[PDB]
Symmetry: C2
Subunit: 593 residues, 2 copies
């Protein structure tokens, strides 16, 4: 029982445990109410709404949870502004997420086994975020790690299922511990580089492994009676290696389908993603994104085999699109961090699916000019331990309206441009975006993580015949159907990625911060947004009909219910209708002319 | 950097011990799938041998066949598979993938996919954990044998799963590695913590010894300086894996509110037994064992302690102790030892997820009982073998002779268990790990029994005193809301016959008959004819037991044995039981032919 043991106990006994508990509860309740999963009584007061949530205790008798909140013009999102108080005889602030959920779900029905996992994820989030917060007291690399807060919406934004406290201290991105990758050799019976990636992959091994070290690895392979020409080389997260590959691949290790080689020469360090590591020794070198079998936000951190296969072809396709577009290339100067090489070992087995794979991505340091710095886009709405907006200084310096205008211009507009001019919808969540700035002045946007979340509407492409052919890349694409991967047959996929991903779940978080902290009204926020959208597309008259057909000004739209998906089995279409703030903003924008 | 433990794991996986373990795990798997009728291969009979042809389908839905040779044995019709398991499609190849074997076989035969995946995972983890153990083993007192029999269960195809241990934890806590460990002491608030039923006085006394007055005093002073009242807490020892990987992360809210308070480490070192949640005191061998909660899955079940069973443990042991001390045969002739679970404590809340997760039962050290020339061996040790295949009882058999040794064994070991059933209506769970042979240089002396709290069944009409039967309904709220057959008490007399045939014989004593036949050419028929003679010899001394003995029907031709593997492949099923022949039946027929 060492110092890390002591740390963990102190973290829990501290005020940071209370604070983290209150936050998970807050976020949980906002989400249940917003999505209409529960339906409290609502008593209106001047600004606030008092919600009364019904439940039943273990004894099948009545209980109320009280809290005060707001229903916001920004997509009708709910903010809970107070403690969540359990009323039976006497009032007390809720101590147990588990108790809260089960009392509340005796009244409203859910699938029990889903409830159980969800409760476990919320508890683990509290646990893991408690010690992150207890452990905290810039520039891009530091900021990635030091914004430890994680997701503003998802009740369990920290679960890390499969990490107990020591692994968490070792691997959690908040702690910034250097680590080494494990190099293995993987037999070509089951291993493949990314589609049409062979030349690039062979070149990247030269710089990544090192030339001499690679020769020495091949000699060792020969010294076992194996033929190095029959193998590819894959880096593996050391946690993944020790806790997953060794036990689940034993059969491949015994027959030399997999050969342990050794440790990377360079040290690496986790990013917000944690399956994504930067080279600490040489920061110009590519990041590596590797398989991790760990459950964070209800999904395993595995890399899908079809997705790994296609990552390089996708980055090459996108890079061409952007390079032939004068606005994106010359004016907004958008940055795409290319996932330019990939490799994987994929056997039939269901249990190991997506468990060993790697994608290399360009460092954002390749792109940063001198004088330029970068911040993760979800950092723009982040706060200091004492609750001060991390962008406070900048806003004081540049003014709120001017800073926000520039932000919309350098960051939001290019994303929407891509949707309307190209029918290409990049996953627009804050975690995919990085703002490049100069002393806090917004300059250009960088985008990443294409291989997982990209969507597109084929008829809008400039060249349909240049659209990468997915069916030739993987048997899974080949046997798949329309809408399963990347391609939508519905034009509404475009409207939805913009309203839902870009605005409701990401940029909208900024509007909350500016309203509550600087008294900059949400109506004025969406005003600026409409104005900049309009200033852009007025320069592109041929886009007029198409802009309209996308309907960004629709008075309401159907938004994903992300939390409901966690409580229910069928989950076919879980959407709820919400108001669209752009609608009213545009009506006022029109009157104002 | 990757260390020497990493290097070991890799060498073990890359070695020949991996091939043997894989082969063994496949063998036990196929044996039980055929035995329980989960699959029904074609059977082609040679003189003795059977060729088994098992159907499957590959992923392209093309037929495949698995082939092996084996036997159906007179001992309960158990299946022995004597040859490698070969996959036949185009060519023939020994099967390398337990997952593939199971996937192909279950494309033909329907199971629950979900259960199939877990089972495959457990089989792979078994292979993985046992490979490291077989690889580390080299080429003996009681304590030394507990940790040196590394083979685990001869029936269950995954006998090593240990779901929740990766290789490093396995090295630390796996009983094969005999690593000394410290218990973690916690204080638990009496709002949720209780001593076992009517155990308060014995518990207070046992904390004196186990913690020490000095430490306990210092423990109380620590709680007091946190502004908590030392009189509101009990004290529970926790496995250090359980504390760090389970309690700390799942009890955070109890730690926050001082429902649970960390005190420190035990003074003494402990070492795991075959059970791994049961720890012996290494520093002071006469001190009691600790059986503690562990949330890991071995053989498909969580290693938690059921709260109701922790609560009734001290009372069950007092009850059994009294039954023995008033019976001349058991007390005087047999001299049976019952290692008493004499104290227990737990912290138990509502939460479903932590159910059974923090609990402790203390048990008497077998060293309390051993005479000056006596030693002890775990009962499943009797059928264990050395890495090279020599039965570990080999020297003893050479010294006393086989028939003489087997008769003494039956007379001192098997008879008193059966006596308990017939005279007392009490069936202790009689499997191999519940029994300890006490011997003098390999001469069988007497039997010691353990693990009462979970396993025991009884038939109320058979009790010598039905009113001395402990009233469980008063001990825990789960017993009081429970129904007949739920815990400990069976309404059917067949409960008793099944505990003898199925637990004592089929899954335990029968394994010895296999070893004697295959190693020494001692025929299974002779083995069972000795068992019958000895049972008869005993009961001819107790005429008052005749009609009771008859009604139990140990000589019935066929009976219903548990299907243990089937249970791992289905959520719900109609039976769980299958009919097997009883070797005591024919043996008795023949024993009768003497007169
Ligand atoms: N012959 C055997 N009979 C019963 N159990 C055995 C035998 N051989 C090995 N074992 C193993 O002993 C282990 C004991 O686990 P268990 O938790 O049931 O014991 P306990 O209740 O803690 O005492 C099991 O994993 C079981 O598989
Ligand atoms: Cl980083
Ligand atoms: Cl012999
Ligand atoms: Mg046992």
């Amino acid at each position: 029982m060492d110092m890390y043991h002591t740390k963990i106990l102190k973290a829990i006994e501290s005020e940071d445990y209370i604070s983290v508990r209150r936050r998970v509860l807050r976020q949980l309740v906002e989400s249940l109410i917003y999505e209409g999963i529960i339906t409290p009584a609502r008593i209106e007061k001047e600004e606030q709404i008092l919600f009364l949530i019904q439940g039943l205790d273990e004894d099948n008798k009545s209980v109320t949870y009280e809290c005060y909140g707001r229903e916001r013009i920004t997509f009708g999102r709910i903010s809970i502004d107070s403690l969540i108080v359990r009323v039976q005889d006497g009032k007390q602030e809720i101590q147990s997420v588990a108790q809260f959920l089960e009392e509340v779900f005796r009244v409203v029905n859910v699938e029990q086994t889903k409830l159980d996992s969800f409760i476990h994820e919320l508890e683990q989030t509290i646990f893991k975020d408690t010690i992150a917060q207890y452990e905290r007291c810039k520039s891009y690399d530091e900021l990635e790690n030091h914004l430890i807060d994680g997701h503003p919406y998802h009740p369990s934004y920290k679960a890390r299922i499969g990490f107990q406290y020591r692994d968490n201290f070792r691997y959690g991105y908040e702690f910034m511990r250097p680590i080494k990758l494990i190099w293995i050799a993987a037999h070509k019976k089951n291993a493949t580089v990314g589609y049409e990636n062979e030349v690039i992959y062979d070149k990247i091994l030269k710089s990544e492994v090192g030339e001499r070290k690679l020769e020495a690895y091949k000699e060792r392979i020969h010294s076992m009676g194996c033929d190095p020409k029959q193998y590819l080389f894959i880096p593996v997260h050391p946690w993944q290696w020790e806790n997953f590959i060794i036990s689940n691949y034993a059969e491949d290790i015994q027959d030399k389908g997999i050969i342990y080689l050794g440790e990377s020469a360079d040290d690496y360090c986790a990013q917000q993603s944690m399956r994504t590591l930067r080279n600490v020794t040489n920061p110009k070198r590519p990041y590596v994104k590797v398989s991790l079998n760990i459950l964070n936000t209800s999904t395993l951190r595995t890399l899908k085999p079809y997705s790994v296969a296609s990552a390089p072809a996708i980055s090459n396709w996108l890079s061409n699109v952007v390079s032939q577009d004068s606005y994106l290339r010359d004016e907004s100067r958008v940055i795409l961090l290319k996932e330019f090489s990939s490799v994987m070992y994929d056997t039939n087995k269901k249990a190991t699916y997506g468990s060993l794979g790697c994608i290399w991505r360009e460092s954002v340091h390749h792109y940063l000019g001198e004088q330029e710095d970068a911040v993760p886009f979800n950092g723009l709405y982040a706060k200091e331990k004492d609750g001060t907006p991390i962008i406070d200084a900048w806003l004081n310096k540049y003014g709120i309206e001017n800073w926000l205008r520039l932000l919309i211009q350098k960051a939001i507009i290019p994303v929407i441009h891509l949707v309307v001019e190209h029918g290409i919808a990049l996953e627009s969540h804050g975690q995919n975006m990085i703002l490049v700035h100069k002393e806090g002045l917004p300059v250009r946007i960088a985008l990443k993580d294409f291989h997982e979340g990209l969507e597109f509407y084929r008829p809008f492409l400039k060249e349909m015949n240049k659209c990468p052919d997915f069916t030739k890349m993987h048997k899974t694409y080949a046997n798949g159907k329309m809408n399963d991967f990347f391609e939508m047959d519905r034009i509404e996929c475009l409207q939805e990625m913009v309203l839902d991903a870009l605005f409701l779940f990401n940029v909208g978080e900024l509007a909350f911060v500016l309203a509550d902290k600087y008294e900059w009204k949400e109506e004025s926020f969406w005003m600026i947004v409409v104005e900049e959208i309009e200033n852009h597309f007025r320069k592109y008259p041929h886009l007029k009909d198409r802009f309209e057909s996308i309907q960004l000004y629709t008075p309401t739209f159907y938004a994903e219910q992300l939390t409901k998906r966690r409580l229910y089995i069928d989950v076919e279409s879980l959407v709820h209708e919400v108001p669209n703030p752009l609608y009213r903003a545009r009506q006022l924008n029109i009157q104002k002319s």
